[PDB]
Design a protein around this ligand. Sequence first.
Ligand SMILES: [Zn+2]
Ligand SMILES: [Zn+2]
Ligand SMILES: [Zn+2]
Lengths: 258, 258
Amino acid sequence: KTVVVTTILESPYVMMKKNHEMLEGNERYEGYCVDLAAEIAKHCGFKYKLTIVGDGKYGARDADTKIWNGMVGELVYGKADIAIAPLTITLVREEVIDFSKPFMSLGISIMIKKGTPIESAEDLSKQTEIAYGTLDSGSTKEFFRRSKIAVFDKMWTYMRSAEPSVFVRTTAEGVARVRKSKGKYAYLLESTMNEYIEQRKPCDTMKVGGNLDSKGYGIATPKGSSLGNAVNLAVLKLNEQGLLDKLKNKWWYDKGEC
Amino acid sequence: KTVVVTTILESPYVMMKKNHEMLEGNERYEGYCVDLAAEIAKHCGFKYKLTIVGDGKYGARDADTKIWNGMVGELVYGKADIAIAPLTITLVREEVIDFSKPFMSLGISIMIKKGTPIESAEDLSKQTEIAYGTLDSGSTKEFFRRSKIAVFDKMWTYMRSAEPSVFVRTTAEGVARVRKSKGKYAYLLESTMNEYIEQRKPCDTMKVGGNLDSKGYGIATPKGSSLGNAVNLAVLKLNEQGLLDKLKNKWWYDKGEC
Ligand SMILES: [Zn+2]
Ligand SMILES: [Zn+2]
Ligand SMILES: [Zn+2]
């Protein structure tokens, strides 16, 4: 049967082609994950259908109702057979779904509007003129919520109680907030996304400091899935052949605008 | 039952303490992996015994007998229950043993004396005045042997027929060869080790250029191991607590002598 792939509209991973209205099925999309999905499918030997997650979220469990949302939820409840997106491998998720070895290594980072007098997470924590937040319903927000590290705990204490909210629904919203903040808002997002945006016009943002942590993205399948083993081996084969590095160069720098 | 842990003497992962002669069992050793093993055994609640792999190798398969050597072999043939060391996650290994999600991210790098006229892998493949090689029976040598990239392929053709042999049995021998070669020898090793040595006196070596690839080290268990699942979650939990970063700081720079 055709494999249902859940993914998310997050540039440069998955995007609508300029003339998608003229196209059909998988041909409507382009991007790093679109390219990766085609390769994984070929090496594993399956036909697939790309679908954008309904609620546009990555995946988090709701305490009380205990219902998983986002791409994780589509896998948990059987709405999708595999997730190919910039989905962070975390303990809570690994407890309900399977992840292949990582296809991309990254870490949480700081995005500022050029000129902002901030160079580290410690800098953000010791001041208050500049506000900062993260994406909502994701691994980045969870990192700070659960952190027992002094600096990060101090950062979370502030963010969770900040008003108006410093959190955003999508990466694009966070980037826009930084650009129009006149330097009064710094955004906390994963390094890969930070690096991508720094190469996009109007070239007014920049990544500062070292990553706050280290983790990776993995292809996810429902627990006990028949595709798990093959997909994992495919990811390892493709990394060792250099495809993964080739794809990042293609979507990040080959198309750099700065 | 006490869990048999196979490991390898490789600074700063596993080393004999200064006063090892008056110590017994696991107390004779110290290092990053020694600390990691203790952490894992505590969260999974099991007793263990650290053992140094008999042949001192990481793990490669004999093309003729098809027999696995090193730590991988000890797991494959049931001589050990788990391997906790800087063992690289690779396709060929993943096919015969299980790996937890990575506990450390790294890549192949270039080590030069200091003052050596080399700044990249390309530079090495352009001349013949400077010899270069890699460790044996490992993931690094296999990287060059199978590479399809023009530069890495040009390098392997040289290393495969080089006379004398540019390959070493241990990282220690490679480093020693760079130091006593007047800069006429360059060593190819994983970034983690490179960075560690660069901070060790006589402080006469340095890492140059970016990593050639991106991979990770993982805790290995035989296939069908009752410890596999739990250990994998243990690694994720530890990374999220910051323990893994804490440990690298401790053994890499806190003890730095440059
Ligand atoms: Zn392919
Ligand atoms: Zn602990
Ligand atoms: Zn043989």
